[PDB]
């Protein structure tokens, strides 16, 4: 059987030799009578320079001597059959020795490697083998057309950007992610997207699809992340989780970062990890429980906080369980079924702040379009100095913590039986020093009151907002 | 048997193709080097200038030539870094003022950089970075190369031509009797980890002399820089009206 | 005492009674301090965290203030 | 920056600038107004855009001067 196996290899060698002869013949025919210098001189002479076809071909290309410069057309070959243009290419320089392969920066072979030449201290994600595709609609269980998992290559790209301090540029289109590992930022970084950049997350391979974070940020002091749209179309998982596993995110700035249809959009669950963080022009929309969820410590746990925290022109809209979401069941790519709801009495709110200090909510919006079940628009507990400057608040559909709907008919009953419940207003304040609200326009509030004060909130101050909007 | 017959025919065909390639390459007397240039590593056959000083000494036959500069300083390969400060240059016949960056002048000619996206890096002017020291009191970085004159040339080019100036991570060391001046509107963008370290030893009044002076910088933007001195001497950034008002200057992460 | 690269010595202090503050504002108008922090971590000798003299309309919105070590 | 037009920034219909943001912008030396926002005229259906944010923006020197009136 060995002879029959090696016959095919011999035929492959034959075909390779014949194709080589064909390329040399093509070159000589195209050259014609004219000399090499004349050919180079022709306005299209740059085509007579050889180039590597793909990153794997570069991994196989053995350099005669260290210090050679070569050109790579694209990371993958075959772009011309497809109607698209090459991407991921560049210039590489050879070195003799050993180095750890990367898939991006460094292409390693036995006893040699090639290093990419980076311009302007910046690079793109295609340089690491990532692919994009057309953006799916925001409907419930809808996946993109073609499913290539970008998790490990995007993780390598983040590692290079943190390690060498290059800026990472991202293109329009969706990057699809379906992996059991969470995507981690572990150091200061610059990420810059385009209008249209999307990160689509599929939770089918996660060990705990309901609670496992898609993306994790820690230690990112002085970073800047902009113009990204994360969504998952599942009502499962955390969108972006901030931790202290590496350190504090001491002055991290987010701009135009959108997080949609997760279970929680932005999540924080431990103290001293968002000191001085800034959100500019961000959005959290259509998540299942909350758009923003901050909770430094739970009840009975040691006290702690993070301070200050700044929001500028941020809007939270549509967060909370709708009737469709309550009845929905997610179908995984392994043909499993996961019930979206926890119990039939689930309620949420647009934003939830616990255990913080010196918080400012400037401008922006908090609304309940689409009629989710909410106890409030904002809930504030155990904070010191929460201040609201001119924030648009509108369209709440009122429920108690129990799940009981708050209508006109039972309004008096609610006031008697749910006095100590943390619910029943557009803004619920509980045990908060130094609370303040100026005079925004509020309307369409289907709840018992517009503001609720409880649990020793003792030096508050209330400006003149639009009166007579609640029940 | 049957497999062996085809396996031997494969050898015969391969040898015949080898002879055919030999013959055509020998027949192509003056065009055989095009076969060399068309190989996947053919771009290495093109020559390039090794450093900016070599570029100053390169005499152009005619105006309008294009050349490649590998790096600003040679010797990166002996060390364990990558080339930096390179680019593409175009020759001109005449006289121009040498810059150290934009223009490399010789006797009776000069070379000018091709700038892309209206932006350039400070390495293009010969600036060097090193490892960032800790914030302890009298602690200096490990390598002491003074960037003041080269960074002032870069600032002048960015103000004059309205290019954006890009800075890499690492520390730039500054130890000179002159103060670094920004004299008009400018865009400056650093990276997380860009540091400017100032040694006040050569200043005439170390206790009160400014490290950076900014004046006349209307509508400019400066971002993501970390200045420190570890000395408790000097002014860090001095805002002035020696050229004009800084009417809408924006500083972000400085 | 700072030691220079020419082996000179410079006394860091001006007088043995030196005091400072975090921010000093004099002769300005329409100043807004939005958010941020002013704090004396590390126990420097401060007369105040912020000193404001001869200004028209200085406004502070929610700034974090903490940890001062008081001196005249 | 927008200078020496009749209006610098013009909006003349509802629901088209929801959540817009101006940072460090300028409107200077226009003939009538620097910023002109008007969702609806008189006798028209009510409408609005909301919210709207200006941050360190300047309107300076707009309006008809004597030279402009005679020009």
Numbering used by the authors:
A (entry chain B): 152 to 622
B (entry chain A): 155 to 408
C (entry chain A): 480 to 551
D (entry chain C): 409 to 479
Which of the paper's sentences describe this entry?
In the present study, Klebsiella phage GH-K3-derived depolymerase Depo32 (encoded by gene gp32) was identified to exhibit high efficiency in specifically degrading the CPSs of K2 serotype K. pneumoniae.
To understand the whole architecture as well as the potential modes of action of Depo32 on the K2-type CPS of K. pneumoniae, the structure of Depo32 was solved by cryo-electron microscopy (cryo-EM). Both the nonsymmetrized and C3-symmetrized maps presented well-defined electron densities in the core region, and they all revealed trimeric architectures, similar to the overall characteristics of the previously identified tailspike proteins with known structures. In addition to the invisible N-terminal anchor domain and the helical-bundle domain (to residue 185) that may form the head of the spike protein, the remaining core region of the Depo32 monomer can be further split into the following domains: (i) a very short neck helix and the connection domain (residues 186–271), (ii) the β-helix domain (residues 272–642), (iii) the connection helix domain (residues 643–666), (iv) the carbohydrate-binding module (CBM) (residues 667–846), and (v) a C-terminal domain (residues 847–907). As is typical of other TSPs, the β-helix domain of Depo32 adopts a right-handed solenoid-like fold that consists of three β-strands in each coil turn that are stacked approximately in parallel into a triangular cross-section.
